[PDB]
A paper describes a structure:
Proteins of the Ras superfamily of small [name] regulate a variety of cellular processes such as intracellular transport, cell shape and motility, as well as differentiation and growth. For all of these processes, switching between the active GTP-bound and the inactive GDP-bound states is of fundamental importance. We describe here the synthesis of reactive acryl derivatives of guanine nucleotides that are able to react covalently with strategically placed cysteines in [name] to lock them into their functional states in an irreversible manner. Extensive analysis of biochemical and structural features demonstrate the maintenance of the signalling ability of the modified [name].
Extending the labelling experiments to other [name], placing a cysteine at the position equivalent to E35 in Rab1b led to covalent interaction with aGTP for all those tested (Rab5A, Rab6A, Rab7A, Rab8A, [name], HRas and Cdc42), albeit at variable rates, but substitution of cysteine at positions corresponding to L125 in Rab1b only led to covalent reaction in the case of Rab7A. Structural comparison of these adducts with [name]:GDP and [name]:GppNHp demonstrates that the covalent linker provides sufficient flexibility to allow the covalently locked proteins to adopt similar conformations of the nucleotide-binding pocket and in particular of the switch I region of Ypt7Q35C–aGDP, Ypt7Q35C–aGppNHp and Ypt7Q35C,K38I,Q68L–aGTP compared with the non-covalently nucleotide-bound proteins. Despite this flexibility, the electron density around the nucleotide and the linker was well defined in Ypt7Q35C–aGDP and Ypt7Q35C,K38I,Q68L–aGTP, whereas in Ypt7Q35C–aGppNHp this was only true for two (chains A and B) out of four copies within the asymmetric unit. In conclusion, the structures of [name] modified with aGDP, aGTP or aGppNHp are very similar to the non-covalent [name]:nucleotide complexes, demonstrating that the structural properties of [name] are maintained in covalently modified proteins. Additionally, covalent GTPase–nucleotide adducts also maintained the native structures and conformations, as demonstrated by the X-ray crystal structures of Ypt7Q35C–GDP, Ypt7Q35C–aGppNHp and Ypt7Q35C,K38I,Q68L–aGTP.
Residue numbers in the entry: 7 to 35, 40 to 65, 75 to 182
Write the structure that this text describes.
Amino acid sequence: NILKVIILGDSGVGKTSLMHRYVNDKYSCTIGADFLTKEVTVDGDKVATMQVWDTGVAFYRGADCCVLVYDVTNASSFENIKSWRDEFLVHANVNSPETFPFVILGNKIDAEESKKIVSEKSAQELAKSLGDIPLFLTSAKNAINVDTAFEEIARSALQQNQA
Ligand SMILES: *CCC(=O)NCCCNc1nc2c(ncn2[C@@H]2O[C@H](COP(=O)(O)OP(=O)(O)O)[C@@H](O)[C@H]2O)c(=O)[nH]1
Ligand SMILES: [Mg+2]
């Protein structure tokens, strides 16, 4: 029924921006709401409501998917991806750590090339080493790939929700 999605990653990577792009299709250069909600549409039907939880017992409870976000211009954000994945599994008490879904987002892909520091290859290798986690490279700013990425986040959440 309701899909709970958590977004983790270092501060400054674009977690809040990606949520706003997904939820409201906007971006500019929310206090008091623990989550924002967006109706998921698949094949032109409304199938479910997604809660997107941006950055605790009630915090982890009920999570259906976990999204991990680095910034392709910040090397340290990328090196911390496995830490965030691990921090989640160690605290969230999920029914089946073996099968719980993560999705990795490499954000700010709109940046000039000279400012990119993390290569696509390195990210594909890490996503693989972590259990073949889906990898998307994204731009909240320019609306690049966030639709396709959340399409897979929603699909992962739906599968976990109904398991
Ligand atoms: C409009 C002026 C500007 O910020 N220019 C730089 C564009 C670089 N490209 C870019 N920047 C992004 C993207 N998403 C988010 N941002 C920027 O990152 C910081 C922090 O974002 P936030 O969403 O607050 O991160 P956390 O919640 O993870 O802390 C902000 O400057 C935001 O504008 C993106 O796709 N591309
Ligand atoms: Mg934020």
